[PDB]
């Protein structure tokens with residue numbers, strides 16, 4: 001059984017922990033401690049093929065670390081998470097993709113743009129804007145809500161589809 005290292009990235013408060021805990025434990029966490037960075041395991045079946053996922057939920061300081069370059073380099077696929085009600089989190093997506101590409105020698109890294117908090121009626125990032133950003137990067141765009149669980153499996157499963165294609 002093939003095992004992949006997934007890394008969830010994005011600005012503080014976008015719902016990285018809430019998305020991950022929904023996928024793993026099937027419940028929505030409000031106010032999860034933003035200093036906790038931890039890895040989770042999950043066996044999934046996608047398109048009739050089993051994969052073991054090792055998901056790293058990034059947290060801690062928004063600072064550079066050679067140690068953090070080392071574990072990001074081991075990542076096979078990345079979720080680029082922003083919140084549809086926070087324009088700054090969306091503008092940050094460019095920096096996250098640039099950062100991942102740097103640590104991985106400019107490889108065409110499997111990534112999926114995730115537009116979280118889709119359950120909120122306080123949108124500031126247009127769907128067209130996020131689709132056009134994913135289009136120029138050549139990656140899928142998935143709209144999620146960690147609160148309602150809408151698109152949670154879609155986001156991680158689509159990243160696994162991208163990793164499978166890249167690995168071919």
Ligand SMILES: *CCC(=O)N1CC2(CC(n3nc(-c4ccc5c(cnn5C)c4)c(-c4c(Cl)c(C)cc5[nH]ncc45)c3C)C2)C1
Nearest residue numbers: 011012034058059060061062063064065068069072099100
């Ligand atoms: C509220 C807590 C939380 O959820 N956080 C998510 C983060 C921001 C994440 N993050 N920041 C960087 C980063 C920050 C500054 C910086 C670099 C490089 N140079 N500078 C000044 C990177 C990273 C980061 C990434 Cl994405 C990668 C691929 C490699 C790397 N090496 N060192 C840092 C990083 C991340 C994940 C953490 C706070």
Ligand SMILES: Nc1nc2c(ncn2[C@@H]2O[C@H](COP(=O)(O)OP(=O)(O)O)[C@@H](O)[C@H]2O)c(=O)[nH]1
Nearest residue numbers: 012013014015016017018030031117145146147
């Ligand atoms: N309404 C709504 N709230 C979310 C969603 N995802 C996360 N949140 C909330 O946003 C805040 C930050 O979430 P968290 O998972 O800690 O973000 P992280 O800092 O990126 O790990 C918390 O109050 C969460 O309950 C979502 O899809 N919808």
Ligand SMILES: [Mg+2]
Nearest residue numbers: 016017034059
């Ligand atoms: Mg967190």
Ligand SMILES: [Mg+2]
Nearest residue numbers: 061063064065
């Ligand atoms: Mg420090």
